[PDB]
Amino acid sequence: MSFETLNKSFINGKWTGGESGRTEDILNPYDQSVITTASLATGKQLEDAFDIAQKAQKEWAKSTTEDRKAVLQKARGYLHENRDDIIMMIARETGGTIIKSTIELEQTIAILDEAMTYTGELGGVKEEGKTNKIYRLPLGVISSISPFNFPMNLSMRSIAPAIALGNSVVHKPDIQTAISGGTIIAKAFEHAGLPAGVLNVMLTDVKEIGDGMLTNPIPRLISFTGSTAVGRHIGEIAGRAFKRMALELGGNNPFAVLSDADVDRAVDAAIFGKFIHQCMIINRIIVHQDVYDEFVEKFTARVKQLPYGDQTDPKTVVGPLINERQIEKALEIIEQAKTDGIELAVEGKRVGNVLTPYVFVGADNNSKIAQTELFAPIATIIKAGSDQEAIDMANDTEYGLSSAVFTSDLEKGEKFALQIDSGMTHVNDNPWVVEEFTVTKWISIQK
Amino acid sequence: MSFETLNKSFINGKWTGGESGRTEDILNPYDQSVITTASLATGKQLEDAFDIAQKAQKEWAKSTTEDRKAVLQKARGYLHENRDDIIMMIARETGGTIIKSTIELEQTIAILDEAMTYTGELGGVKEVPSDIEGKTNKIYRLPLGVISSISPFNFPMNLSMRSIAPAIALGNSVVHKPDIQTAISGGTIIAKAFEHAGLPAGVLNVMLTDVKEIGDGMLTNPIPRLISFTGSTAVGRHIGEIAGRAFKRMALELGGNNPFAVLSDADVDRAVDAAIFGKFIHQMIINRIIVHQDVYDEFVEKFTARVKQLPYGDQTDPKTVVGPLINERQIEKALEIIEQAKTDGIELAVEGKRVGNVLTPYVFVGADNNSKIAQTELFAPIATIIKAGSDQEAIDMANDTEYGLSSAVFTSDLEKGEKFALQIDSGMTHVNDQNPWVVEEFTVTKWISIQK
């Protein structure tokens, strides 16, 4: 319950100071107070870490199903037994509310449970004088990067299966969320007796390491979550080295409300999806003309009653943004939409480091504000002429990760979801992981 | 049967001349004689083709299983009925031997036979209903969209069809670019086959062009969702960067240093034989051959004697083993490499020579695994034999390559071969020789949650 102590890189089963001579003060983004001070690791220390991970993995690739299922279970136990303090810390460092923070811890725990489920997945499938043995083997070293939003959740999304499948990990969280994004998790794994070097958490920054996490020839996978513009950068470096990539990108996710929507429920989903749960990340809310005025009115009034302020207060829904730079980003976007004439149904303010909700209405699906991945409590409502047009406006974007469609007709929701060019869709709002973190090897044997 | 008539692009169901002004003579490698002349299509034409492929794919996605099996059947049917003429043409264009060409036409047919088994795959699975009551999670198997497909001058037809047939099977469309020098066997014949089969206009587009016209056109167009490529590593990196930046999928196959390991307990005679078929008849390219010490001298003598016999010359002759190299730049490249190893000290057990555009086999022996001739991709009839002092070193030496795609191990102990096979960083190992992974490559997984 003294996580602030956990301010160092974890390399080789040992807490290590950064030898860069620099520090980052990690702040509560609501009040700008220091939670803790972290020394930053070097370009050399990262290199040593990947070496160490390469070594440790050759051993970890030979551990039993037992040990691995065991390490994960103890690690999950550590998190669960300490859930109260961890949720608090997550909220402090992250600026996510107690509600959001709880969901993140639990999601993290669920990942661990899920990963226990495929620990025994390293055997062989035994398939005209020939015979064909298919084998599932560990990939190698994995390079893991997580962002400032949902940092614990998204870290474990890589760290858990990696370890579950005989891999090793060099993990780098955003420094401003290092504790939630790396050092708590590192403690759980140490606690659970993870062999030295199978998990390395790096407290560092760009000034120190450049593209060190992407450029090193050792790792055979870059797992990343963050913006698409950083994605593009990672994707170009990795493709060029022929590294496998597990990219999860924020996207421009359309929330479509159809002619036959139950509106109250749509409002609920939109409010909860956009702010409380902060589902997917919602940017554009496309609504059918026949229920437009109603949906706008109720959404607008429900938005204006959302409490904002200190995230550590259970009543708070909209907490501060992570830092200055993100506040400026949201403001520039908001200024631009204003000079473009787009109406502001709800106009917010900068209060300290909290940006209060904005709601833009009657926007073009093609407008600059509609076509922007934001991560701010900014909503853009867009009128659609028909259900077909709602579906097409949803398609008119280059970033589709997720989508939501609200409709009373579940059959027709499903036919419409199939037309949305995206991996996931929710109508009224498991095996493929193993594959990302393993090599299927083929041996043909002759008579 | 006048396959030289097929010197055009096949765009949107039509034989379409090139609009660039420029033309290239497609040559027989042995004598430099002109098979046809092909007009080169333009950047603009390629963009039309991608545009056209995107449209046709929306409609092709709506095809039934039967529609799709029928198209493949008539396609495989066209190639088998016409096997004799096709084999001849693959040989003429490509400089590959009638034997090599027959194997290639056969493998191409095999690929079409295989596609039919999974054309059925485009349908929805349910599972994992979530903790929430009233919630249903459904996964559907849908087409990817438009495939960008690029093939090289060696094994043009086989490699092209390795992308064309699954693509079309799984409701995709395709813009395809063979090396102009092998456009007939790498493109036009295939287009003729699918046309014969009543494949809708626009679903298969074959571009006769060159990079001089098209620059990175196959790579940069926002349309296609997968780039399929076989060729050099440096072009690979160039594709990886462009496709990585744009988040397109990529099926890259890159040269290509395949080790042949021959362990102490191996049957030598089987191993010499299998090394000849792989290195000379079939051409999976065996670059360097690694042979354990106690069986080394026996392998060399046998492998050398046998290589010395092989028939060289006109590749259209059904008993020629070593035909011409694809072009003159390949010969100069081969010879300069051979000079490199000579000045470097490496023994030459068997010395080849240049007859016209044919080079006769060269065998270098007792080479370092860390040698220029050992580490280099060539695709020339050059073999390199490397001494190993243990079976573990043999396998170590096989590993130590820029990259490994395929490997071969020869051992009497089948348990030992499988366990060493497991120790090589390579997708495939065969012991004593020489598809659901594809369905995932050419389809997308769509997930839908519904709520009651």
Swiss-Prot record, chain A:
Induction: Activated by SigB in response to stress due to ethanol. One of its GO terms (molecular function) is aldehyde dehydrogenase (NAD+) activity. It catalyses: an aldehyde + NAD(+) + H2O = a carboxylate + NADH + 2 H(+). The active site is at residues 248, 279. NAD(+) binds at residues 226-231. Disruption phenotype: No effect on vanillin degradation. Its EC number is 1.2.1.3. It holds the Pfam family Aldedh. The keyword Oxidoreductase applies. Keywords: NAD, Oxidoreductase, Stress response. May contribute to protect cells against stress due to ethanol and related compounds. Belongs to the aldehyde dehydrogenase family. This is Putative aldehyde dehydrogenase AldY. The lineage of its organism: Bacteria, Bacillati, Bacillota, Bacilli, Bacillales.
